[PDB]
């Protein structure tokens, strides 16, 4: 069902894994739970057309209360992209680089 309208917060710096997949821990600051977490990679912050691919299968925030946790993993493209969590003006982004 519906996406998460509130703001996220990285609770730890994203980290590269096995062959270049990045994992992300966030904390959600909204009371519209339950809701699907807006997670994706992107290269154009205007279009937010998904680059890469979200590896986490259907990430939904569980609780209906403020401050819940969540862990996501994505498959970023080669070179430079942006991790993009949340929607709107409260979007959070972190630059990513993947070599080979």
């Amino acid at each position: 069902y519906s996406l998460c309208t509130a703001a996220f917060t990285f609770t730890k710096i994203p980290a590269e894994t096995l062959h270049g997949t990045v994992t992300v821990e966030v904390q959600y600051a909204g009371t519209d739970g339950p809701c699907k977490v807006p997670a994706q990679m992107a290269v154009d912050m205007q279009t937010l057309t998904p680059v890469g691919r979200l590896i986490t299968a259907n990430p939904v925030i569980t609780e209906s209360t403020e401050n819940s946790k969540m862990m996501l993993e994505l498959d970023p493209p080669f070179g430079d992209s942006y991790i993009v969590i949340g929607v709107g003006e409260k979007k959070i982004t972190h630059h990513w680089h993947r070599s080979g």
Partner: antibody
Framework: VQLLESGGGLVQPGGSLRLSCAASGFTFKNYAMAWVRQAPGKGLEWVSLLYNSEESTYYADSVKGRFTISRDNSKNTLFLQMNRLRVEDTAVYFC?????????????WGRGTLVTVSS | DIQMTQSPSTLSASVGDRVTMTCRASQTISGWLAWYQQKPGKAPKLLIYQASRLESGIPSRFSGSGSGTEFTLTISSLQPDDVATYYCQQYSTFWTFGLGTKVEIKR
């Protein structure tokens, strides 16, 4: 940069009206759009919002099932299909662009189109 | 949902005076708050976003400040063009609008 609403007027209770808004001055496809109404002498009430997908469309409980919004990115046009109208739906309806991708400050407003659900 | 209360409901003051209105939210809305001016019959004009960021083109006399649960909009030197109602908007979770603060002018 402009929003222009049209389609409003007088509807019989239980009737149906289809509002539309014409966007200009920006990549309409990129921004979230919403309809915010204002009953006469009352406050602002957001009624519906949409960005891309089924998951990124929202409806205030007061119009759930009754209203529907639609996005025609080829024509840069927003629709609000309201059915089963009730007398208290009488209000001015503002077509509104979100700052970004949804649920932000509202930095582009229409002119208002007044829907009068009367009998 | 997050209820929003504004005060004062109405107020009259004089050209030059420092007007100050307040609004409180039923729970933490961080800094995700915006202020709108709406003269009758026209549409709202956003003035402030993120509690305290002045929108582009809005006059400098308008300011904002606040965090978490209580916020304040402050017109430093009232001007005849400011006769309007003033609404606040939270946007931490969905949207909620205040009921307004009507500013009348004393001459």
């Amino acid at each position: 940069v402009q929003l222009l609403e049209s389609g409003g007027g007088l509807v019989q209770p239980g009737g149906s009206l289809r509002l539309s808004c014409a966007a200009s001055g920006f990549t309409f496809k990129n921004y979230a759009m919403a309809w915010v109404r204002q009953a006469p002498g009352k406050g602002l009430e957001w009624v519906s919002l949409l960005y891309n997908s089924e998951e990124s469309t929202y409806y205030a409980d007061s119009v759930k099932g009754r209203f529907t919004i639609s996005r025609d990115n080829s024509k840069n046009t927003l629709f609000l299909q309201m059915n089963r109208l009730r007398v208290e739906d009488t209000a001015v309806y503002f077509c509104v662009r979100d700052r970004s991708n949804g649920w932000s400050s509202i930095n582009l407003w229409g002119r208002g189109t007044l829907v009068t659900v009367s009998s | 949902d997050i209820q929003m209360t504004q005060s004062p409901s109405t107020l009259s003051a004089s050209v030059g005076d420092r007007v100050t209105m307040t609004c409180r939210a039923s729970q933490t809305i961080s800094g995700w708050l915006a202020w709108y001016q709406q003269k009758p019959g026209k549409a709202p004009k956003l003035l402030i976003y993120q509690a305290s960021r002045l929108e582009s083109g809005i006059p400098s006399r308008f300011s904002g400040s606040g965090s978490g649960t209580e916020f304040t909009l402050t017109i430093s030197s009232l001007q005849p063009d400011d006769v309007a109602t003033y609404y606040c908007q939270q946007y931490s979770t969905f949207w909620t609008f205040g009921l307004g603060t009507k500013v009348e002018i004393k001459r």
